[PDB]
């Protein structure tokens, strides 16, 4: 395919995406020194998707990391595989990016959008053709939500043709020090719905819930959850990274997946839930993967899909596997759950098969759905926002920073209309 440009925002983005780069780089078998270790061509069939050659025809990841809190550069260059990146895009701010919008959205950051467009165009010059973008960020704080929406709009202006994809992390009361989050989340998704092509709801509420109620870890840190999300988003990327029969692409994924012109929020899931292990593992086999793919406590959104409907479905299986067996159980799952799925698009539950095992697990898969259950998450966020908003709170910060009340009101109008749209498409008929 054509090349992909990766964009990384804020502390959360930098950490999550650095771990993701590590995960796939191990998967594609590339050394920290850029040395080559892979033992087959099937590893480098789609290495050009991300990695670019060096002067020594040494493959280098192509990504950009953005933030304003200048303490992140050393965090980048202190990870295990951190020094992997080109010493040209470690461009950051110098005076902090306190979690206030219109500071990174209007006040500043808008002064460095020239810098970020300069760097992204500079490294897409070496890109023979452009496929799309990978913005990783979270919905809280300026560097993060505000910069992410600003970047999305800017590149949408400059590149109206290609695709625009992003990963969303929604901060939650369960693990959050600050409290100015719901304002950030709603102000973000308002830009996000109307300005991107597809987005992944990598939630924290469901993440914490499952990690504490089954994985039962004492202190969910930026280490554990970083590992979880890096693994899952690697699993999502595999389908493009691998050659598959369901030989899907970003534009193809949009066309196949996108049901409405404003409902492009996915629910990345993973069947074999995995903590920080040492040995190979305790063994898992096919029917276990079948069951745990679509359980109630394995996704990344605190919702039970049996209370809703799927617009579409998608999966990407891993490891040496019986394709006929897989098709048999999938046919049964689409047979024994007739009401579970929408009647608007038959032949929606698509399936693919991959070969390279995950670097640590034998037989796994990667669930990338598109449900009508996401209304629960959006309703949650909007309700907490308006609870913080019915009486003013810190809102003087925003108003004195540049917004007005009308922008907040219209953001809520847009979100509640979106929830109405999801409700409507969730209660269709024949």
């Amino acid at each position: 395919m054509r090349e992909i440009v990766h964009i990384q925002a804020g502390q959360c983005g930098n950490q999550i995406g650095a771990k993701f780069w590590e995960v796939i780089s191990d998967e594609h078998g590339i050394d920290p020194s850029g040395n080559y270790v892979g033992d087959s061509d099937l590893q480098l069939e789609r290495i050009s998707v991300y990695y670019n050659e060096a002067s020594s025809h040494k493959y280098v990841p192509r990504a950009i990391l953005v933030d304003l809190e200048p303490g992140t550069m050393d965090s980048v260059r202190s990870g295990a595989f951190g020094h992997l990146f080109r010493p040209d895009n470690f461009i950051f701010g110098q005076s902090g990016a306190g979690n206030n919008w219109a500071k990174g959205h209007y006040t500043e950051g808008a002064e460095l959008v020239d810098s970020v467009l300069d760097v992204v165009r500079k490294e897409c010059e070496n890109c023979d053709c452009l496929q799309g973008f990978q913005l990783t960020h979270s919905l809280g704080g300026g560097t993060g939500s505000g910069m992410g929406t600003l970047l999305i709009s800017k590149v949408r202006e400059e590149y109206p043709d290609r695709i625009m994809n992003t990963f969303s992390v929604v901060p939650s009361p369960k693990v959050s020090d600050t409290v100015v989050e719901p304002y950030n989340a709603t102000l973000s998704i308002h830009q996000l719905v109307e300005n991107t092509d597809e987005t992944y709801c990598i939630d924290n509420e469901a993440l914490y819930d499952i990690c504490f109620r089954t994985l039962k870890l004492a202190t969910p840190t930026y280490g554990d959850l970083n590992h979880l999300v890096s693994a899952t988003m690697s699993g999502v990327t595999t389908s493009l990274r691998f050659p598959g029969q369901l030989n899907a692409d970003l534009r193809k994924l949009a066309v196949n997946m996108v049901p409405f012109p404003r409902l492009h929020f996915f629910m990345p899931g993973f069947a074999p839930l995995t903590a920080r292990g040492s040995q190979q593992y305790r063994a898992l086999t096919v029917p276990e993967l079948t069951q745990q793919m679509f359980d109630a406590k394995n996704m990344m959104a605190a919702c039970d899909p049996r209370h809703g409907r799927y617009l579409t479905v998608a999966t990407v299986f891993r490891g040496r596997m019986s394709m006929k067996e897989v098709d048999e159980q999938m046919l049964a799952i689409q047979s024994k759950n007739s009401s579970y799925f929408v009647e608007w698009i038959p032949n929606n539950v698509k399936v693919a098969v991959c070969d390279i095992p995950p670097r640590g697990l034998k037989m796994s898969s990667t669930f990338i759905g598109n449900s009508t259950a996401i209304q629960e998450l959006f309703k949650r966020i909007s309700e907490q926002f308006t609870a913080m908003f019915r009486r003013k709170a810190f809102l003087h910060w925003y108003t004195g920073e540049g917004m007005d009340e009308m922008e907040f009101t219209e953001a809520e109008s847009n979100m509640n209309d979106l929830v109405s749209e999801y409700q409507q498409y969730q209660d269709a008929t024949a």
Binding site: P173, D177, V179, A387, M388, R391, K392, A393, F394, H396
Partner: protein
Amino acid sequence: MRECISIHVGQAGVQIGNACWELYCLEHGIQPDGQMPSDKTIGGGDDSFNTFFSETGAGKHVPRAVFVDLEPTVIDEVRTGTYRQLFHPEQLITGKEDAANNYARGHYTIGKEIIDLVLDRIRKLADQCTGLQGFLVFHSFGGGTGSGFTSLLMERLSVDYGKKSKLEFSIYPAPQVSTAVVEPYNSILTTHTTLEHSDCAFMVDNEAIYDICRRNLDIERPTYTNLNRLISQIVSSITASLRFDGALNVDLTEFQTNLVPYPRIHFPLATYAPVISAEKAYHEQLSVAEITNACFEPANQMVKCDPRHGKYMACCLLYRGDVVPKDVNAAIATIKTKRSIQFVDWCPTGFKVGINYQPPTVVPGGDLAKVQRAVCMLSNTTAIAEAWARLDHKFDLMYAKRAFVHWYVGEGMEEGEFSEAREDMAALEKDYEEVG
């Protein structure tokens, strides 16, 4: 790397500043001849004590503060007190005639002819600064100089510097040491014209300080050296956060963020616990759990109001010496006994703690003695409406029959100002009462 400027207005303000600056000397080991052996005597600083002392090439550590008085009766005393050599050649402000308990005289007649000099002094001091956070002004609601001139100063500052914040320390004057009867008009007329240019203001009630000194200090005659010393100790304890070194609550901006939800609600209430009686050598020992247990008692707060009737916003804390955060967590668990505690539904809760690894400093030859641990809870309660209601009762009584009104009208004020300020304070107390 972040400068700070303070300023003293009025007799109460200048006396408090006198009582505070020598405490500030003591804390860092600064002495009227001190040199703080770890410095180069040429700007040796940029630590958290640089925010006040802009030390010169003479190794002097001159401060950043000026004192205001409409008629020299206390500013002279600091000019010829103890730390005489500690101030510049006539950097201070001296007048010729006080506002004499008349808000109007300082707000329209006298100060409106002296203010420009004060602003020139403030600007000239600020020029030597590089990274000023904001101002910390000391005044009182009692007289007309420390009140009318303060409100006028607020207007002038907000005109010339609106971006920067400016924390406030105020006194809610009490009948006990009442040196007038026209205080309530000044108080309403100052709180009404303070909001639009205020950001966060602390009131310390001379009723409360008087009660504390008479009860738990074994003093029956609280001069302006006893209550003054106690308030200086409280102020030093509260500002120690920015003063000594880095922890919770570094900056005035951070004060606002973690304290004030709603710009019409920005009067935080400060509580204390260690009230060491006197030179009494031996009573018993002390525990950190004990002092944090005591910091909830209504008798031990800087302003009289019983908070078992209302809800808190953000109950910060500070500590001196003997770190033990597990004991602090136990303290939170204990105070969770929900007998007299509350929080507000909308926003979650945080008991942010910052530790100073220096034992609290004490007045050497004063009514106290050195201890090892200290703590001060700045609970932004909703109960702070008691003071406003109490003062509103008296203002309404006096305005019933238009008493004393001429002494304000005949000086450059209109009759409608009183009514509109009363209505505005009514709106303010409504804004407190509705939260819940």
